[PDB]
């Protein structure tokens, strides 16, 4: 067989095929050395780890594909692993992949098709046959607090009422031979659905984790697409093709039916359990900083011959918590404000601001017609963007003008450092939900849960008026395009590189 | 011949012997070319222009040398141009420069030695043989408002009193056949000493600009060293030998005795003339935004055979109002916070913030015995770096831990996205004087001389208390050193770059 994009068995495929994987056939620890080399690919932009030979791989569980998501070394196919998710060219721009994401919003959506079997049922092991804690599940990090099986799987939850089936990743390690504990925050849609299990109050929530689902659906997973919208037919709709599912065994959810691994089990809705401490998307870890997560049970694993886990080393740049995380809220961003009536063409997480930040690309011949102000204009932008769960992990926003690429992260600090005044030209919101992820929240002086957000206005005044009144000095601006020309015409003969 | 940083015709020899020079023997146009082929250069960290052949070199004025404290393409030896300003290895590390040009501050000065003659005397053009409108001073970006000969010389400038020779850089223009135009403003060492001139009321300033000399000379010539400190006596002292100066001809200034061309007359007391607009260091011109200058009178000039003209495009990255203006000012800034008790162990502007910030790494083990906090702490750095000169330029301060390498812009962001909580964790300081150059200051919102700065403490809380208590999610810190060697030793045995 099927396309890369739908079968996660042939996205790794397409990385041979492209040069971007190394296959590792030589034994390789778990603890730690498979998570220090992909963590050293991430620093270093090199080709994805495939670890086909796992200390502790036992009956086909399993091996990893580390950095599934992450940067190419090429500026021409930087994002080309991204591309291979979507059946996109590998030299696709980010512009292009953010709009194949938004692409099925103004889609209906395409249901998916329930199959018999598929290639996730080749193998069982039932409640008597596996232990969790037998498996070789990775320590990531030296100080991680558990060894983290879930950095790149899809959890799949419903609400009670059935119509909403919600599919995303949250982080999770093993806790013992049968359960997982992990994160589950609010407001994330698994946190939503697992408040409205509670609030009925009768039984645990029912659950599966699927790894190494099609790789269009592990996209939308990082997305944070509409609340009540489910994410099959959003993917369905966005790769114009019905996904096709298989029921787990133990329960009446559906999962994908190339999936690597399938776990099933139950959410509870009263245990917890001993969680992290992780090294997270920021590039941080706080040694003991152990609390209570939600616990999960594993009734039943079901997986592929051969089964590939896939694995985020995260942290430093650059990674899947990067380049997905960040840019897939940028890309729903975006929409949110073109619905709520601003002019805004393009947004990004700049990788530079460990994506904390989102630039927002203004179209300043729309902001002109509006006859407003930086102060009245920042508010509405802030109100609209740090008010919905799409705003959630970004803590800044800064609004550029036209002539700023927002997908350069150059031109970006060039535009915030050199438009925007300190505080004048901000400002400050603290009465919104903020990320405990970042440390200076959750390790902060303030409140882990509120405030801290920030809009940043590099417009300068007059893009709010008549027009931009400055030409950058720069080669392609401050020199006429003949002599630009021969300039370039010339450089080699003249003895330049 | 005469040694590199004493001599600037052996300095273009030592770029040549370096691999660092391109020259360029063909016609080249002052018009635009000459500058548009440096802001290429610049914009790629390529090897410096020489402009033997300028369309309308008439009697030996003049050559050009485009870029002459750039940046290299090699991260082995970026900063060699600056090196080869001051007698250091090409490898010198950015630490290595800004150390040798603090050297002199606890030093003796060593006055310089008056010699009858120089190269700088072997030809001379009186007040009816020169005109200023007929050399071939370039244009240097497409809007600027006027000729700017006046980017890389050294302004001379004493005291009423003669206690106090200063040398500086600021930019002047040609307003016709025997006068320039430029900026005199506070709190520049060239604005002070003129102040002392009107207020005395007698006559106009006696001034020499001398081009192409000493690069150890033009070096303090961009640095804030404090007032009332001749910097001849300084260079001096930092290159451990006395600099050799001859008088002018028709004043009592001296001059290196090795510049490549002299300008002598008078900086007036009284006239003023049309200045600008010219395309500056934070990457902007504002085209037809012309304002009234200091008025330069040129009686005489003198200059070397076969003389070359020193210039700087400067626009955006990475030129010398980057290395030199941004790197100079964080020396000085370091130096001032030691000796004002604060623990401040290395300072840099970052380029990413278009040298408008300056990162201060802090001794965490010295803050930890000071027993204080963020707001505290912010308050007294901020008061001691914005309340003086060598704090001008500067708009945003950021403290950093040991943990962070300020000359890595990489890490100064990264620090400052994370450990930095927008608003609470920041103080802002609005009756401090402000750099009317950066657009969101001169063309912003808000009073062009005043205010818009801050000091963002990315310290994070227990580096106040009992110490850093994270590592780093990234492979140096996430992972034992025994493992990071392996995966090293086997990185291309595996099949890694
Ligand atoms: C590698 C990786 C790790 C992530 N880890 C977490 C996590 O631990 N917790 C979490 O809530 N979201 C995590 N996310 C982000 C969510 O997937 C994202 O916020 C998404 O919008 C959640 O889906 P939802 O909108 O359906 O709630 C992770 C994403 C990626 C790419
Ligand atoms: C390429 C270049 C251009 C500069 N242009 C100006 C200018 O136009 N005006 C100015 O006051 N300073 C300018 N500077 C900066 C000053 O040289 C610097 O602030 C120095 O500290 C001034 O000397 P002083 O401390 O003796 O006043 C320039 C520096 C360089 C490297
Ligand atoms: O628990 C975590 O590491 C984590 C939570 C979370 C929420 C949103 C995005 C990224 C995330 N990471
Ligand atoms: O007039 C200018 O371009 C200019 C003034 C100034 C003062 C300090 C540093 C850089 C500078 N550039
Ligand atoms: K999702
Ligand atoms: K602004
Ligand atoms: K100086
Ligand atoms: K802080
Ligand atoms: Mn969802
Ligand atoms: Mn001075």
Same mark, same amino acid.
């Given at each position: ?25 030589? $034994? ?177 929530? $029912? ?228 990320? $405990? ?9 303030? $409140? ?50």
């Amino acid at each position: 067989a099927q396309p890369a994009h739908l079968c996660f068995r042939s996205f790794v495929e397409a990385l041979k095929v492209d040069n971007d994987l190394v296959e590792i056939n030589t $034994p390789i620890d778990p603890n730690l050395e498979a998570a220090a080399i992909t963590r050293r690919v991430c620093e270093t932009n090199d080709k994805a780890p495939l670890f086909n030979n796992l200390i502790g791989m036992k009956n086909g569980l399993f091996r990893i594909l580390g950095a599934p998501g992450s940067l190419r070394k090429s500026s021409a196919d930087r994002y080309g692993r991204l591309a291979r998710h979507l059946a996109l060219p590998p030299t696709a721009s980010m512009r292009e992949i953010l709009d194949k994401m938004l692409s099925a919003s103004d889609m209906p959506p395409i249901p998916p098709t329930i199959v018999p079997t598929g290639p996730c049922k080749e193998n069982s092991l039932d409640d008597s046959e596996f232990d969790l804690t037998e498996l070789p599940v990775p320590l990531i990090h030296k100080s991680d607090g558990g060894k983290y099986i879930q950095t790149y799987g899809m959890h799949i939850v419903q609400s009670p009422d059935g119509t909403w089936t919600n599919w995303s990743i949250a982080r999770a390690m093993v806790h013992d031979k049968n359960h997982l504990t992990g994160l589950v925050i609010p407001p994330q849609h698994i946190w939503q659905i697992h408040q409205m299990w509670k609030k009925e109050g009768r039984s645990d929530v $029912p659950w599966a984790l699927a790894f190494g689902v099609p790789p269009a659906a592990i996209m939308a997973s990082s997305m944070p697409i509409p609340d009540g919208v489910t994410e099959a037919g959003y993917v369905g709709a966005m790769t114009g093709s019905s996904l096709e599912l298989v029921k787990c065994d133990t329960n009446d959810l559906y999962v994908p039916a190339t999936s690597e691994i399938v776990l099933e089990g139950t959410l509870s809705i009263s245990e917890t359990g001993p969680e992290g401490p992780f090294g997270e998307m920021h590039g941080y870890i706080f040694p003991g900083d152990t609390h209570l997560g939600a616990k999960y049970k594993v009734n039943r694993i079901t997986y592929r011959n051969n089964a590939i886990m896939p694995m985020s080393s995260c942290g430093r740049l650059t990674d899947e918590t990067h380049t997905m995380i960040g840019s897939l809220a940028a890309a729903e961003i975006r929409k949110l404000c073109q619905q709520n009536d601003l002019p805004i063409t393009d947004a990004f997480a700049p990788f530079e601001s460990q994506v904390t930040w989102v630039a927002l690309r203004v179209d300043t011949e729309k902001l002109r017609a509006m006859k407003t102000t930086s102060e009245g204009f920042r508010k509405r932008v802030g109100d609209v963007v740090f008010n919905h769960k799409a705003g959630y992990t970004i803590h800044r926003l800064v609004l550029v003008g036209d002539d700023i690429d927002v997908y350069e992260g150059k031109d970006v600090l060039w535009a915030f450092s050199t438009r925007c005044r300190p505080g004048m030209d901000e400002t400050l919101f603290e009465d919104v939900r903020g990320f $405990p992820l970042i440390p200076y929240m959750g390790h902060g002086n303030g $409140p882990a849960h509120r405030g801290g957000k920030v809009v940043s206005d590099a417009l300068m005044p007059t893009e709010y008026t008549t027009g931009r009144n400055w030409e950058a000095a720069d080669f392609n601006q401050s020199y006429p395009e003949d002599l630009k020309q021969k300039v370039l015409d010339n450089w080699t003969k003249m003895g330049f590189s």
